[model samples]
Target: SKKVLLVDDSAVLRKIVSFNLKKEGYEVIEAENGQIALEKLSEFTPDLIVLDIMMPVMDGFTVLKKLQEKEEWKRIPVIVLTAKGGEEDESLALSLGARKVMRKPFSPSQFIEEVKHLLN
Candidate 1:
């Protein structure tokens, strides 16, 4: 089954992305913080991981750095939600292993395109 690890501090965002995937026949493991997300990774790796760089306890940047320590975990694709994080974050996230950066607005449609459903 296609599963995704959706991590974001905003419950509003988590719900939006979670249900959108579920509606398309995919499963989701939601975490409100970066720490919680890594905890899930211990249990099992999802097909993809969605991260919001802004959060408490642990931020997306830190998580990206740590994900590099592990072999299996590093292979999983990751998307970091971004805005400025320019000079430092926006670019740093990619170098740290973020597969893509998601911008606000037009996400539902754009994200839907990223996932493989009609791979038929």
Candidate 2:
């Protein structure tokens, strides 16, 4: 089974995303913030990361930048699942090597489909 990192500040959203990913047979690892996610990466290397932009401590952009800097870590696909829905943010994510950028209030099916596509 593939593993995924769910990085969001919202506990409720984290659970919801984990539930959906679990149902799809993906091993889900939850992180409340980018810093926590980074710590978890020390022991667990997730296949992909669903990252939110507006996170506490360390935001998604900073984490994404760091991910890009590390060759071993940079290959893991990152889909920017953030509320910062703008062309600029989208461009930034793409430039930073994020695979995709998705806005908030997205459907479960859409999320799953996008993730599967990226995984392939």
Candidate 3:
């Protein structure tokens, strides 16, 4: 099974994403915030990462920086999912090594498609 790490602060968002991913036959692992997600990295290696920017303890940008610094994890695709919708934000994420940057109120099917394409 494909493993995906879903990182966000909202419980509802995590649950909804996890359900959809699970329904699509993905093994879902969740972290409530960037810090927890970073910690989970020590124990879990995910094929893809769905990340959120506005999080407590640490932010997705910082996590992305950390990911970039690590040779082994740098190649892993990161999909940045955030409420901060703007060309600047999107550009920054892409420039900072995110494979894709999605805004809030994202379509589940579109998200899944992106995940599938990135994984393949």
Candidate 4:
């Protein structure tokens, strides 16, 4: 089974994503914010990461930066999950080496597909 780390601030978003991904047979681990997610890294690593940009106690971009510093984490794909619709942030995320950027209010089906592809 594939493991995915969901890093976001919203409890509802985490529950919804976890529910859908679990239904599709994916193992899901969740963190309430980037800080918690970073702490989880000490004991666990996921094949893919779904990260939210606007988060308390360290934003997603900072997490991505830290992820980039580690050779082990470089291979794990990160997809930015954010409400920021600005094209600049999207481009910046891409430049920062996030595998993909997904905006807020994403479709469940699309999210599943993207997650599967990244895992593969």
Residue-wise C-alpha lDDT for candidate 3, range 1-120, written one tens digit per residue: 989999888787778788989999999989887789899998877999998764332576788888999987898899987665355666777998789866667688988888888999
Tens-place lDDT per residue, model 4, 1-120, is 989898878787878888998999988889887788889998988988988775332577788889999988878898886665456667777898879977766788888888878877
Question: Higher-TM-score candidate among 1 and 2?
Answer: 2
Tens digits of per-residue lDDT, candidate 2, 1-120, equal: 999999888777778778888998999888888788889988978899998774332577778888899887999999887664365666788888789877777678888899899889
Off by over 4 Å in 3: 54-58, 84-86
Clashes of each: 1, 0, 0, 0
**Clash pairs for candidate 2:** none
1-120, model 1: which lDDT tens digit per residue?
788888889888778888888988888889888788888888997888888775232577767887888898887788777764354677778888667877776478787776653222
TM, every model: 0.86, 0.89, 0.89, 0.89
lDDT of each: 0.76, 0.82, 0.82, 0.81
| TM-score-better candidate, 1 vs 3 | 3
lDDT of model 4 at residue 8?
75
TM-score of 2: 0.89
